[PDB]
A paper describes a structure:
The protein coded by locus [name] from CFT073 [name] was identified as one of nine potential vaccine candidates against ExPEC and was able to confer protection with an efficacy of 33% in a mouse model of sepsis. [name] (known also as EsiB) lacks functional annotation and structurally belongs to the Sel1-like repeat ([name]) family. Structural domains composed of several such motifs are thought to act as interaction scaffolds to mediate protein-protein interactions. We have solved the structure of [name] from uropathogenic [name] to 1.74 Å resolution.
Here, we report the 1.74 Å-resolution crystal structure of [name] from CFT073 [name] determined by Se-Met SAD phasing. The crystallographic structure of the functional unit (aa 24–490) of [name] has been solved by SAD phasing and refined to a resolution of 1.74 Å. The structure is composed of 11 [name] units, which to our knowledge represents the bacterial protein with the highest number of Sel1-like repeats solved up to date. Electron density corresponding to a magnesium ion is identified in the [name] structure, with the metal-ion-binding site located between repeats SLR3 and SLR4. As the likely origin of the magnesium ion in the [name] structure is MgCl2 used in the crystallization conditions, the natural metal ion for this system and its binding specificities remain to be determined. Furthermore, crystal contacts observed between molecules belonging to neighbour asymmetric units share similarity to contacts characteristic for TPR-protein interactions with their physiological targets, suggesting a potential physiological interaction mode of [name] with yet unidentified targets.
Residue numbers in the entry: 1 to 467
The structure:
């Protein structure tokens, strides 16, 4: 428009708009050397005339301590001048000051008054603030319906936080009936904007086919975008996609790197998967006991029951007497959380008196818990517990039933052989009873096998009436 000298002439003539603009020339330092003293002087001259935008600007300068000592209380006074005259940005900032108790005592109801005025003028930050207020019940009574309405207005204008909130609410059924498809649409808007959490959530939805068609390639790309921004969950989820070759060839070395990124942030899942790669190895990844133990221990300490079970198992396979005791303590923690492998491992520890005093009655209890969760190895051991009467009264019918369950479950060879051996011990009626019992156990405690069997079983025909 006009240069500095021409602008100066207008400002000195008393034009408030020119005074504010001149202030900004000094503030920004583009056409003239940055000079906060001169910037403030001209900002103040414009505000002297009650020029609303300049009053708002002094609010910013006092709020931020730019060219003046930071002073929230004074910022509030300036914002209120401009807010009372309807300037949306001043209303929003004043609302924030009240919400935070910056320069004024916290007043959540008052914050909502100001957010509402800014929101009614269509500012997306105000609309978001109203959404958050109704979502939190902060200065207003909680109302997820109202929250959704305000978030929608903000999200339509590109407000990313509001997109994520809508994604969340539609996923959880807050103020609206759960709809995974609509949830995914909102998270997609977020993800396309470059948002780490929108990418994370949409990736997870493509992984499991929630609200969208299952698609590991889309999942990989979205997890990658979120992981590159540092998200520890996205990092291990991407790692798993890569290790398992779900969207490409298996890439175990690349998986390792992503698991390590996750693990180093303290993510117990990342720590688990990193440890698991060192535990089991993969193509190009050597087994490493020390690393497996170290990373399982961090994961286990964070309550990961899979890590607890696997750490104990490493110690049981190869460990000192103290390591066996530690293993039992880990199995105990994981068994308490319901991890079937830990219940099984604890059961066997108690049968042997390995790392713990031998206790066959307690062994049978843990073994049954594991067997009921479908672990065929536990079904075999529980069968032998009944066969030999270890912490239970000997019962060949129960033995046969658990062995047949294990055999049918996942073609456990020891189940099959033990069943065949036990059968000779049974009368014809005991065998009938054991077969019925195994049918019950298979349906309840090997349900995947039950379903497979039911779909394949020979069925009888029915004769239709004729003539
Ligand atoms: Cl703006
Ligand atoms: Cl695993
Ligand atoms: Mg709040």
């Amino acid at each position: 428009n006009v240069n500095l000298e021409q602008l100066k002439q207008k400002a000195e003539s008393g034009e408030a708009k020119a005074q504010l603009e001149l202030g900004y020339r000094y503030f920004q330092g583009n056409e003239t050397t940055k000079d906060l003293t001169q910037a403030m002087d001209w900002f103040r001259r414009a505000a002297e005339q009650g020029y609303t935008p300049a009053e708002y600007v002094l609010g910013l300068r006092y709020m931020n301590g730019e060219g003046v000592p930071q002073d929230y209380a004074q910022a509030v006074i300036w914002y209120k001048k401009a807010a009372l005259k309807g300037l949306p940005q001043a209303q929003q900032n004043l609302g924030v000051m009240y919400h935070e108790g910056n320069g004024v005592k916290v007043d959540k109801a008052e914050s909502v008054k100001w957010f509402r005025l800014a929101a009614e003028q269509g500012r997306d930050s105000g609309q978001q603030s109203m959404g958050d207020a109704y979502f939190e019940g902060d200065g207003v009574t909680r109302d997820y319906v109202m929250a959704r309405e305000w978030y929608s207005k903000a999200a339509e204008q590109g407000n990313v936080w509001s997109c994520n909130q809508l994604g969340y609410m539609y996923s959880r059924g807050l103020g609206v009936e759960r709809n995974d498809a609509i949830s995914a649409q909102w998270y997609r808007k977020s993800a396309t904007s470059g948002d780490e959490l929108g990418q994370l959530h949409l990736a997870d939805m493509y992984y499991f086919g929630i609200g969208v068609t299952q698609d590991y390639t889309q999942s990989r790309v979205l997890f990658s975008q979120s992981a590159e921004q540092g998200n520890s969950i996205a990092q291990f989820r991407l790692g798993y996609i890569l290790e398992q070759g779900l969207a490409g060839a298996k890439e175990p070395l690349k998986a390792l790197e992503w698991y390590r990124k996750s693990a180093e942030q303290g993510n117990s899942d990342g720590q688990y998967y990193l440890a698991h790669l060192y535990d089991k190895g993969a193509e190009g990844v050597a087994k490493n006991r020390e690393q497996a133990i170290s990373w399982y221990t961090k994961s286990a300490e964070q309550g990961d029951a899979t890590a607890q079970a696997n750490l104990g198992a490493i110690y049981f396979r190869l460990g000192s007497e103290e390591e066996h005791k530690k293993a039992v303590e880990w199995f105990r923690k994981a068994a308490a959380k319901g991890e079937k492998a830990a219940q099984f491992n604890l059961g066997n520890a108690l049968l042997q008196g390995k790392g713990v005093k031998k206790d066959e009655q307690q062994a049978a209890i843990w073994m049954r818990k594991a067997a009921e969760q479908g672990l065929s190895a536990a079904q075999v051991q529980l069968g032998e517990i009944y066969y030999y009467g270890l912490g239970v009264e000997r019962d060949y019918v129960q033995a046969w039933a658990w062995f047949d369950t294990a055999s049918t479950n996942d073609m456990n060879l020891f189940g099959t052989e033990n069943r065949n051996i036990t059968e000779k011990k049974l009368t014809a009626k005991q065998l009938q009873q054991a077969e019925l019992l195994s049918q019950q156990y298979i349906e309840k405690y090997a349900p995947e096998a039950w379903a497979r069997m039911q779909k394949l079983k020979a069925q009888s025909a029915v004769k239709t009436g004729n003539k």
